[PDB]
Paper text:
Transcription initiation of snRNA genes relies on a specific factor called snRNA-activating protein complex (SNAPc). SNAPc binds a DNA motif in the upstream region of snRNA promoters, referred to as the proximal sequence element (PSE). The core of SNAPc binds two turns of DNA and recognizes the snRNA promoter-specific proximal sequence element (PSE), located upstream of the TATA box-binding protein TBP. Two extensions of SNAPc, called wing-1 and wing-2, bind TFIIA and TFIIB, respectively, explaining how SNAPc directs Pol II to snRNA promoters.
Reconstructions from 3D classification of this dataset showed two distinct particle classes of the SNAPc-containing Pol II PIC. Further 3D classification and refinement identified these two states as the closed promoter complex (CC) and the open promoter complex (OC) states of the PIC. We obtained structures of the CC and OC states at an overall resolution of 3.4 Å and 3.0 Å, respectively. Comparison of our CC and OC structures bound to the U1 promoter provides insights into the mechanism of TFIIE- and TFIIH-independent DNA opening. We observe 19 nucleotides (nt) of the DNA template strand spanning from the TBP-binding site to the upstream edge of the DNA bubble (at position −12). The templating nucleotide in open promoter DNA reaches the active site of Pol II ~30 nt downstream of the upstream edge of the TBP-binding site. The DNA strands forming the open DNA bubble are mobile, leading to a weakly resolved map. Subsequently, 12 nt further downstream, we observe T (position +1) of the template strand immediately downstream of the catalytic Mg2+ ion at the active site. This posits residue G (position –1) as the template for RNA synthesis. The CA dinucleotide is the signature of the Initiator sequence (Inr)34 and is located at register –1 and +1 of the non-template strand. This observation suggests that the TSS position is defined by a fixed distance from the site of TBP binding, as is known for protein-coding human genes that have their TSS within a window of 28–33 bp downstream of the TATA box.
Residue numbers in the entry:
A (entry chain a): 5 to 146, 162 to 184
B (entry chain U): 9 to 51, 332 to 376
C (entry chain B): 60 to 69, 81 to 177
D (entry chain b): 29 to 68, 76 to 107, 120 to 411
E (entry chain M): 159 to 316
F (entry chain R): 151 to 238
G (entry chain B): 412 to 470
H (entry chain V): 3 to 98
The structure:
């Protein structure tokens, strides 16, 4: 019910700063006052339902082909959300088998790329066991793109071409 | 459900030919005798029905048969609508 | 309205009644069939007749002697074209300000 | 194998559940959440050292990461988009209903959801092990109301990946495992000899072409046999077929799709659709127990058929061809049923075929 | 014969009418007009140029009350679609009706398939099928200088 | 909304369907036609060929050929010459 | 209406229903109105003998 | 109608009428009007006295259509009644 | 990879509803019928059983009552007319070949008699058309002709004979009627309901008499709590507990002489503090 | 060329040389059909040659549906023996082919408009009547239905050589318009 809007707003405000510092995220959290996003009269069912939906949203934002800045922002978002709930059983994040295989090398790169803020956030979210490791994503019954062009032609690609030419 | 149909048909024939028999002179007693003898008489496979549509596709016959009576294995069945397929 | 309903009998009986009349703006049809409003100046230059299409609502009721009556209405049936007097209520120039008339090459 | 989709949001390709559990367990060995132990200055140093080891950073770097990344009520203000709609809904409800008390149907599904999650076993010897592969199956309620063709009701059960089918079977609370048979038209007081559960114990699961027949309880039979009889002769779709024994077979021994309907037929004609909502690994904040584990966590709360003469009791008796009933299948509580028939010695009055009614809104 | 001659005259003059359009004004059915049309061509030893999607755009769009910009977009879409061979073997009227539906849905003046079929004489199913063939390459077919009231990405699902 | 394009007029498909459903009149045997032909003569002394065809439900050519052998044409100046079902 | 009756009579006689649109001859009103204003002969072209002349003049 | 006076019911009608006429207490006329009414009544009832769906699959061997009556000869045909299944080796269907 | 994604999207465009998997889960492709019945289903049908479909009760709609009235009237007319129609046709066919003028006049007299009887029939008022609320009609003809098939024959039959036939008093209960009901109930004992419906001096069926007695029977509910009632209620609540919101209906249906209202009131006021 | 056309249907005729009753044949033949209210002939189908024979009161029979000249002759002789068995003096006079439909595929989508503009004197392509082009070859009198998928349906022939000649003539003309 409009939560996607505020989530995308936070993601955009973060990717505009071009930061990987969780301090900028903490400031954006205090300014947009997400400490209230869950606050409000809900009994228990709307509460945990909306929490499930918000976590699923932040997770699907975390995945490719979304930008690295957007991905780290969604990771910080998952962290903040899961760490900020009202229900006693802190709803877990639904993590697939296919997406885990890529989140592995993403965490590895974050360690490698000296982005230790997001790396520690992810290690913490694993340490407190916030993950329900499902088979197929969410359940089953019944965008900021990544251009291939730049994957094909880079500044380095054209530079090597001109050097060899 | 077959015998209920036959009871209905028998009653039908009786209340229909009642006036005919009172007209030509046949007393009601002879009529009830016919009824009883017929009921007692009640105690190869053939389907007698009305085809609503018989379609053919080069081998595949598709029958849509209206109200009909069958004699499957000596026991006689009733049907009010019978779709069916067959291969030539 | 004054026209008597048309009664056909030759058995099924058909009745036709012309209910209501509709008149559209003076229209011209290009050879390709596209309608377009006909300006009086275009009619003068291209030797067209300044006429408005005439439509009538017709109700068709049929009695088949089976005690069943089927009634269908053919809304806005084209029955011809009426020449339009210029600057009359049904003319395109009606209700146009003097500035609008000049834009249409009308005095 | 991989849970890879078959359709975008409706199905996946058939995969071996055991291999899926094995892949998850392997990719989480020694670095996974597979502890199942509830959360509890000296520990700060150990945490910093672990962070330094895992992230290839200095102890000071670990300490500052821990400090900076630290964690960071009803009325609201300073609106946002979703907070705006929430506040508006709340104020609308404020001008609206005078009794804020939570609806009795929300509390029902909620309590059914959180009935026994976070309840650890008192034995701690049968407690499930790590990677126990919870499958959240939902069985479709049978069509016992007209409204159940429109929106197909269902009950969700948290089956275990080692729960050994004929355990799910023995636990599904349908009402076709009830309904003492026999017609009591001259017996007002008759001992119920055998519920349909006892009489017709045969049942089977249809999963990916294969049948799994409840060959236990040798008073059982092969309900799948009939189907095979006409899949071999006069092929009407469905091609090839297979059959198994369902007794040795446990869950995660299958090769199934998710979100794809599968069959559970018990008592011969009652049909139950066994869609698998999702397979998720075991995690704490649930029961972790084994005894109560099939865990029906959702049920429909159906309607309860009351007596037709008085409306103060439930329908214990269903009568047909009655001599006093306005409707043909007429539902009588025991009190009035004893008073419209069986007078002064328990002898039939008029004519009626009276069968015992279970009133499925009450049971299972 | 008169109905078939009327059909041939429209083709010869460069303003073809569909067989259905000629049948609407004639008591003779479409099948009988089409049969007489073939015989008349044989008898006269004459021919008629093949109909193109642009031969019907002006009448179909004008009857649907579409603006000139939408008519131009529909004319371009059908002509480009035929050139790109996205609708091989389709009747030109079916392609034009689908193009009009595509152009109509991309502008303020939106027309349903039933509306376009009634004027075009094409069943809404046929418009759906032809539209579904050109929908994938919608951005390529539209004119470059077209103002999309509804973005090409959000074109109607079918 | 007038003269909307259509492949066939509704009044025309219904008439076409009725003609197909009814089917062409069959050429029955001479004896049956003769027996039915004379029974018609009983009701009315004089019969018109167009109306007589409906009673016989036979092809016009076939009816004329059989009627020609026995029936004769009598010229009436009031309306027209009609057929006579009397052999003499 | 005279030709609508005549046209519909032929179809109803044959036992088939008639198309109302095909019964209407739009030339009757379009050309009849146009001819009287075009020529000034007032009435019918066939009956021009009794038709009043000079009613319509070029402005 | 000369179609439905061949089943067990119609055969019973014919046999009962034969026994009664051979007893010299009814006239053949009353018998034939009774038969004609039997045909009308069975045509009417056999229409709206039943509603059980059946669907049969078989291999058609011989068919024939004279004077608007179909005559099929199905072999190894199964009749799916509402609930049960009947199997018959050979059945003659007569349809008109 | 891109072409695999395109193929996935195409199959998404080309991608059953969980409606096609209801009771006949195994439907055929050449037909629509399922598999034959199971020997377990045979055994269960025998020894008697009520399938789920056979237990469905739909509340009767206002218009269905008028439809059934019109149906009964029309079919009574048809059954009364068929004999006279056949009589008249037989008389006409006899006249066609009698060739005897005195016999022809006798036949024309009989035909006039038949026509007169038919005119009396088609002028028979609604009362004689109704019947004796227990007569027979081709109800299987009704359910398939007048009704689309929404109601079984026997269902319509019981509704008509017991409930809908206009010979059943549908008026409101007068003080005198309610008095007499309880008076006769006491005189016979609260068991002999057919005789009470008879003795009531009105055509109300035993069903309605029992209804009007129960709706004012005070012994229907116990109204007074005892300790064993409380013990049983506590045991049941603890057995079928879910936290809060105990299902009071499924508890009542294990107790005798109580309804959910009194159970709620007791559990709230004297079985937990507050 | 390289593509040989597969025959699909062959209408031949034969003269029995004796008048027949259609009622007798129809009542006494196995797979006969005869509804004179719709068509005055007896339609007798047989399975092995898979053919449909129309038999007429005059004694003339037409066998259709066989996919070979020899196979058509054999089906005709089968129907002849059938009629002979039902009690008639059947004979076998002037068994003569009257049509042979062939069909083949060239394996490439064709541009029709190019073809109709190139051979306007032959092709009669109207996609609102029949979505195929109709090329009326003249040297052999054979009508060719050409479709956008490349399916060519030749018809009107009187011998197999005629279909072969016609398709070889039409092949390069289509090769020229491969889309
Ligand atoms: Zn069940
Ligand atoms: Zn009761």
């Amino acid at each position: 019910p409009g939560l996607q809007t505020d989530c995308e707003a936070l993601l955009s405000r973060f990717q505009e700063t071009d930061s990987v510092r969780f301090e900028d995220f903490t400031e954006l959290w205090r300014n947009m006052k997400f400490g209230t996003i869950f606050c409000g009269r809900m009994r228990n069912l709307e509460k945990n339902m909306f929490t499930k939906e918000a976590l699923a949203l932040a997770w699907r934002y975390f995945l490719p082909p979304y930008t690295f800045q957007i991905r780290v922002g969604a990771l910080y978002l998952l962290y903040g959300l899961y760490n900020t709930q009202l229900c006693q059983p802190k709803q877990k994040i639904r993590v697939a088998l296919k997406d885990w295989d890529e989140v592995l090398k993403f965490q590895q790169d974050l360690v490698n790329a000296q982005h230790f803020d997001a790396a520690y956030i992810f290690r913490k979210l694993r340490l407190d066991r916030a993950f329900h490791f499902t088979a197929m994503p969410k359940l089953l019954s019944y965008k900021d793109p990544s251009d291939r062009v730049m994957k094909l032609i880079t500044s380095d690609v054209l530079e090597e071409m001109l050097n060899v030419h | 459900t077959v015998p209920k149909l036959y009871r209905s048909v028998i009653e039908d024939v009786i209340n229909d030919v009642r006036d005919i028999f009172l007209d030509d002179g046949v007393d009601e007693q002879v009529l009830m005798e016919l009824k009883t003898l017929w009921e007692n008489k009640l105690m190869e496979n053939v389907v007698v029905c009305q085809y609503d549509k018989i379609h053919r596709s080069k081998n595949k016959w598709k029958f849509h048969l209206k109200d009909g009576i069958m004699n499957l294995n000596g026991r006689d069945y009733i049907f009010s609508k019978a779709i069916g397929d067959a291969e030539w | 309205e004054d026209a008597p309903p048309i009664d056909l009998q030759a058995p099924p009986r058909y009745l036709l009644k012309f209910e209501q009349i509709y008149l559209s703006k003076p229209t011209h049809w290009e050879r390709d069939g596209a309608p377009s409003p006909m300006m009086p100046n275009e009619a003068r230059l291209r030797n067209l007749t300044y006429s408005a299409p005439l439509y009538v609502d017709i109700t068709k009721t049929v009695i088949k002697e089976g005690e069943e009556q089927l009634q269908t209405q053919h809304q806005k049936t084209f029955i011809g074209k009426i020449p339009i007097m210029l600057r009359s209520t049904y003319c395109l120039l009606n209700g146009l300000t003097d500035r609008d008339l000049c834009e249409l090459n009308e005095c | 194998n991989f849970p890879e989709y078959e359709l975008p949001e409706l199905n996946t390709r058939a995969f071996h559940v055991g291999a899926f559990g094995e892949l998850w367990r392997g990719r989480l060995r020694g670095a996974g959440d597979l502890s199942l132990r509830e959360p509890p200055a000296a520990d700060s140093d150990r945490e910093d050292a672990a962070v330094a080891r895992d992230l290839d950073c200095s102890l000071e770097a670990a300490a500052e990461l821990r400090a900076v990344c630290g964690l960071d009520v009803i009325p609201e203000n300073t609106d946002l988009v979703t907070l705006g709609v929430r506040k508006r809904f709340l104020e609308h409800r404020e001008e609206t209903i005078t009794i804020d008390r939570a609806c009795r149907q929300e509390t029902f599904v909620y309590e059914m959801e959180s009935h026994a999650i976070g309840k650890k076993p008192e034995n701690s010897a049968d407690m499930i092990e790590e990677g126990e592969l919870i499958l959240s199956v939902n069985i479709l309620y049978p069509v016992i109301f007209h409204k159940h063709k429109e929106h197909k009701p269902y009950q969700t059960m948290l089956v275990l990946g080692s729960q050994k089918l004929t355990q799910l079977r023995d636990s599904i609370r349908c009402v076709s495992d009830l309904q003492i048979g026999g017609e009591f038209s001259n017996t007002p007081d008759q001992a119920p000899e055998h519920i349909s559960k006892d009489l017709y114990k045969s049942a089977f699961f249809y999963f990916e072409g294969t049948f799994y027949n409840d060959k236990r309880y040798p008073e059982c039979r092969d309900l799948s046999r009939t189907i095979i009889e006409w899949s071999e002769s006069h092929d009407r779709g469905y091609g090839k077929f297979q059959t198994a024994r369902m007794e040795d077979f446990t869950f995660n021994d299958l090769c199934i799709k998710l979100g794809f309907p599968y069959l559970y037929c018990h008592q011969g004609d009652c049909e139950h659709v066994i869609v698998i909502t999702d397979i998720r690994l075991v995690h704490h904040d649930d029961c972790l127990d084994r005894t109560l584990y099939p865990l029906l966590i959702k049920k429909h709360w159906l309607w309860t058929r009351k007596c037709f003469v008085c409306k103060m009791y439930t329908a214990r008796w269903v009568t047909n061809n009655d001599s006093f009933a306005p409707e043909d299948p007429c539902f009588f509580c025991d009190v009035c049923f004893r008073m419209l028939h069986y007078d002064s010695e328990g002898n039939k009055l008029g004519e009626f075929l009276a069968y015992p009614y279970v009133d499925p809104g009450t049971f299972n | 014969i008169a109905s078939a001659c009327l059909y041939i005259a429209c083709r010869q003059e460069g303003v073809p009418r569909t067989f259905k359009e000629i049948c609407a004004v004639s008591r003779i059915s479409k099948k009988e007009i089409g049969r007489c049309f073939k015989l008349i061509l044989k008898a006269l030893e004459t021919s008629v140029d093949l109909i193109t999607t642009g031969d019907f755009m002006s009448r179909f769009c004008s009857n649907l009350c579409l603006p000139k910009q939408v008519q131009m977009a529909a004319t371009h879409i059908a002509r480009k679609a035929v050139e790109l061979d996205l609708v091989p073997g389709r009747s030109p009227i079916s392609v034009a009706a689908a193009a009009i539906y595509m152009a109509s849905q991309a502008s303020a003046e939106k027309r349903t398939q039933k509306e376009i079929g009634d004027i075009a004489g094409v069943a809404d199913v046929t418009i759906r099928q032809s539209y579904r063939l050109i929908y994938p390459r919608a951005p390529d077919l539209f004119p470059t200088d077209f103002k999309f009231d509804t973005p090409v990405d959000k074109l109607p699902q079918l | 909304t007038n003269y909307k394009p259509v492949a066939n007029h509704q009044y025309n498909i219904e008439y076409e369907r009725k003609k197909k459903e009814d089917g062409k009149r069959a050429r029955a045997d001479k004896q049956h036609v003769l027996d039915m032909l004379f029974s018609a003569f009983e009701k009315h002394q004089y019969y018109n060929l167009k109306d007589l065809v409906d009673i016989t439900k036979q092809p016009v050519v076939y009816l004329k050929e059989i009627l020609k052998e026995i029936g004769v044409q009598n010229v009436k100046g009031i309306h027209k010459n009609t057929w006579e079902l009397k052999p003499e | 209406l005279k030709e609508v009756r005549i046209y519909a009579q032929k179809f109803i006689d044959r036992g088939k229903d008639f198309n109302l649109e095909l019964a209407i001859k739009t030339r009757i009103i379009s050309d009849g109105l146009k001819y009287s204003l075009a020529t000034g002969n007032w009435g019918d072209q066939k009956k021009a003998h009794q038709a009043r002349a000079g009613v319509s003049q070029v402005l | 109608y000369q179609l439905y006076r061949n089943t067990t019911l119609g055969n019973s009608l014919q046999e009962s009428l034969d026994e009664l006429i051979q007893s010299q207490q009814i006239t053949p006329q009353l018998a034939l009007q009774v038969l004609l009414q039997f045909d009308k009544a069975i045509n009417a009832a056999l229409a709206q006295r039943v509603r059980n769906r059946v669907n049969f699959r078989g291999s058609l061997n011989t068919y024939r259509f004279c004077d608007n009556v179909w005559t099929f000869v199905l072999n190894d045909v199964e009749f799916r009644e509402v609930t049960e299944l009947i199997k018959v080796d050979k059945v003659k269907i007569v349809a008109c | 990879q891109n072409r695999e994604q395109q193929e996935e999207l195409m199959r998404d465009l080309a991608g059953t509803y969980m409606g096609h998997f209801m009771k006949p889960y195994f439907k055929d492709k050449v037909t629509g019928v399922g598999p034959p019945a199971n020997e377990d289903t045979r055994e269960k049908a025998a020894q008697g059983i009520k399938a789920f479909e056979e237990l469905l009760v739909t509340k009767w709609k206002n218009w269905e009552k008028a439809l059934l009235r019109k149906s009964v009237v029309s079919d009574r007319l048809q059954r009364l007319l068929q004999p006279k129609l056949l009589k008249l046709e037989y008389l006409h066919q006899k006249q066609s070949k009698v060739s005897s003028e005195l016999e022809r006049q006798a036949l024309e007299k009989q035909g006039r008699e038949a026509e007169k009887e038919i005119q009396d029939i088609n002028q028979l008022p609604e009362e004689a058309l109704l019947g004796n609320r227990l007569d027979s009609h081709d109800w299987e003809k009704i359910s398939n002709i007048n009704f689309e098939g929404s109601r079984s024959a026997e269902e319509i039959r019981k509704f008509w004979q017991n409930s809908e036939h206009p010979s059943i008093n549908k008026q409101e209960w007068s003080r005198e009627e309610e008095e007499r009901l309880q008076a006769i109930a006491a005189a016979h004992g609260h068991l002999e309901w057919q005789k009470i419906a008879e003795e009531l001096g009105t055509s109300r069926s035993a069903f309605q008499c029992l209804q009007k007695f129960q709706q004012h029977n005070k012994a229907l509910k116990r109204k007074e709590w005892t300790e064993e009632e409380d013990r049983m209620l506590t045991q049941l609540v603890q057995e079928m507990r879910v936290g809060s919101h105990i299902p009071y209906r499924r508890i009542v249906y294990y107790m005798e002489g109580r309804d959910s209202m009194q159970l709620i009131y007791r559990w709230t006021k004297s079985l937990d503090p507050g | 060329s390289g593509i040989v056309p597969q025959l699909q249907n062959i209408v031949s005729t034969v003269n029995l040389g004796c008048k027949l009753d259609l009622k007798t044949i129809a009542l006494r033949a196995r797979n006969a059909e005869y509804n004179p209210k719709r068509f005055a002939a007896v339609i007798m189908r047989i399975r092995e040659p898979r053919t449909t024979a129309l038999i007429f009161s005059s004694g003339k029979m037409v066998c259709t549906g066989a996919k070979s000249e020899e196979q058509s002759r054999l089906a005709a002789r089968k129907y002849a023996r059938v009629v002979q068995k039902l009690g008639f003096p059947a004979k076998f006079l002037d068994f003569k082919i009257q049509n042979m439909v062939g069909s083949c595929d060239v394996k490439f989508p064709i541009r029709l408009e190019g073809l109709v503009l190139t051979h306007q004197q032959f092709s009669s392509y109207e996609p609102e009547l029949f979505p195929g082009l109709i090329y009326r070859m003249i040297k052999p009198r054979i009508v060719l239905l050409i479709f956008v998928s490349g399916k060519v349906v030749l018809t009107g022939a009187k011998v197999r050589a005629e279909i072969y000649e016609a398709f070889e003539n039409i092949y390069p003309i289509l090769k020229g318009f491969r889309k």
